Design an enzyme around this catalytic site. Structure first.
Site, PDB file in Angstrom:
ATOM      1  CG  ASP B  25      35.158 -28.218  -6.082  1.00  0.00           C
ATOM      2  OD1 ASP B  25      35.102 -29.355  -6.594  1.00  0.00           O
ATOM      3  OD2 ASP B  25      34.331 -27.319  -6.329  1.00  0.00           O
ATOM      4  CB  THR B  26      38.587 -33.244  -6.751  1.00  0.00           C
ATOM      5  OG1 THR B  26      37.262 -33.749  -6.536  1.00  0.00           O
ATOM      6  CG2 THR B  26      39.379 -33.480  -5.468  1.00  0.00           C
ATOM      7  N   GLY B  27      36.618 -31.031  -8.390  1.00  0.00           N
ATOM      8  CA  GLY B  27      35.853 -30.749  -9.592  1.00  0.00           C
ATOM      9  C   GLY B  27      36.180 -29.392 -10.189  1.00  0.00           C
TER      10      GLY B  27
HETATM   11  C1  LIG Z   1      30.402 -23.677  -5.044  1.00  0.00           C
HETATM   12  C2  LIG Z   1      30.317 -25.219  -5.185  1.00  0.00           C
HETATM   13  C3  LIG Z   1      30.160 -25.863  -3.775  1.00  0.00           C
HETATM   14  C4  LIG Z   1      29.112 -25.624  -6.086  1.00  0.00           C
HETATM   15  N1  LIG Z   1      29.265 -26.830  -6.895  1.00  0.00           N
HETATM   16  C5  LIG Z   1      30.178 -27.931  -6.614  1.00  0.00           C
HETATM   17  C6  LIG Z   1      31.648 -27.703  -7.010  1.00  0.00           C
HETATM   18  N2  LIG Z   1      32.002 -28.203  -8.369  1.00  0.00           N
HETATM   19  C7  LIG Z   1      33.195 -27.489  -8.902  1.00  0.00           C
HETATM   20  C8  LIG Z   1      33.197 -27.263 -10.419  1.00  0.00           C
HETATM   21  N3  LIG Z   1      32.360 -26.278 -11.077  1.00  0.00           N
HETATM   22  C9  LIG Z   1      31.711 -26.603 -12.375  1.00  0.00           C
HETATM   23  C10 LIG Z   1      30.718 -27.806 -12.474  1.00  0.00           C
HETATM   24  C11 LIG Z   1      29.717 -27.574 -13.638  1.00  0.00           C
HETATM   25  C12 LIG Z   1      31.504 -29.129 -12.716  1.00  0.00           C
HETATM   26  S1  LIG Z   1      32.170 -24.801 -10.366  1.00  0.00           S
HETATM   27  O1  LIG Z   1      31.178 -24.130 -11.192  1.00  0.00           O
HETATM   28  O2  LIG Z   1      31.950 -24.825  -8.945  1.00  0.00           O
HETATM   29  C13 LIG Z   1      33.765 -24.077 -10.680  1.00  0.00           C
HETATM   30  C14 LIG Z   1      34.179 -23.715 -11.967  1.00  0.00           C
HETATM   31  C15 LIG Z   1      35.433 -23.129 -12.152  1.00  0.00           C
HETATM   32  C16 LIG Z   1      36.295 -22.960 -11.063  1.00  0.00           C
HETATM   33  N4  LIG Z   1      37.588 -22.421 -11.243  1.00  0.00           N
HETATM   34  C17 LIG Z   1      35.866 -23.298  -9.777  1.00  0.00           C
HETATM   35  C18 LIG Z   1      34.600 -23.852  -9.581  1.00  0.00           C
HETATM   36  S2  LIG Z   1      28.282 -26.964  -8.235  1.00  0.00           S
HETATM   37  O3  LIG Z   1      29.081 -27.450  -9.306  1.00  0.00           O
HETATM   38  O4  LIG Z   1      27.510 -25.750  -8.297  1.00  0.00           O
HETATM   39  C19 LIG Z   1      27.177 -28.285  -7.761  1.00  0.00           C
HETATM   40  C20 LIG Z   1      26.135 -27.996  -6.881  1.00  0.00           C
HETATM   41  C21 LIG Z   1      25.255 -29.021  -6.513  1.00  0.00           C
HETATM   42  C22 LIG Z   1      25.466 -30.316  -6.995  1.00  0.00           C
HETATM   43  N5  LIG Z   1      24.598 -31.358  -6.597  1.00  0.00           N
HETATM   44  C23 LIG Z   1      26.504 -30.594  -7.889  1.00  0.00           C
HETATM   45  C24 LIG Z   1      27.351 -29.562  -8.303  1.00  0.00           C
END
Ligand SMILES: CC(C)CN(CCNCCN(CC(C)C)S(=O)(=O)c1ccc(N)cc1)S(=O)(=O)c1ccc(N)cc1
Ligand SMILES: [Cl-]
Ligand SMILES: [Cl-]
Lengths: 99, 99
Positions: B25-27
């Site tokens: 997860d690059t995000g």
């Molecule tokens: C469990 C993941 C698969 C769920 N997601 C995607 C991963 N993004 C990763 C970035 N995140 C923050 C985001 C606001 C940018 S996160 O909350 O998952 C996170 C925070 C901190 C750390 N250390 C690790 C992960 S999701 O963001 O819930 C999501 C779900 C549906 C769509 N359409 C779009 C985004």
């Protein structure tokens, strides 16, 4: 290009004639942007994970440009804390993970 | 390897002698794993997710293997929808985004 991960991989996108900054997110199934206007039909959706869920509007067949790359796909719109480009659009620009 | 994004970039990791599936997860700034036992002392950390901020446990200098690639770094533990490998370890194993 080749994008390093030492920093958040933020890129400029253009959508609705708007320029925006967004996160290339390999962990996101779909693109989701902060509140904006988009043309056409939409349907509600819940997306969530860490910290819970948020309600979004799903627009389909939206045109977008990422780093000069043109692509069409679904864009979710709602109270995301950050603009995210998801796999649904990353694939269209031919983006891959490499190590 | 070279990983395309038509499906989730789910890979096998090894931590504490056990195999687990995780999302590249690059995000994600940091790596977050489902509730598990890890050695040593931990410190508190707040992470910002799509639905809000939450508290997780930070363990440092932990051995973890990602697709067979050895790493030693910070691992967070908490109520995450899936095991997530974030930029702290992606950088370590030499991962980039390419298009
Ligand atoms: C469990 C993941 C698969 C769920 N997601 C995607 C991963 N993004 C990763 C970035 N995140 C923050 C985001 C606001 C940018 S996160 O909350 O998952 C996170 C925070 C901190 C750390 N250390 C690790 C992960 S999701 O963001 O819930 C999501 C779900 C549906 C769509 N359409 C779009 C985004
Ligand atoms: Cl605590
Ligand atoms: Cl680390």
């Amino acid at each position: 290009p080749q994008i390093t991960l030492w920093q958040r991989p933020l890129v400029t996108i253009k959508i609705g004639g708007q320029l925006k900054e967004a996160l290339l997110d390999t962990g996101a199934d779909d693109t989701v942007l902060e509140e904006m206007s988009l043309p056409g039909r939409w349907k509600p959706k819940m997306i969530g994970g860490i910290g819970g869920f948020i309600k979004v509007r799903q627009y389909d067949q939206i045109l977008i440009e990422i780093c000069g790359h043109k692509a069409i796909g679904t864009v979710l719109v709602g109270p995301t804390p950050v603009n995210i480009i998801g796999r649904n659009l990353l694939t269209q620009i031919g983006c891959t993970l490499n190590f």
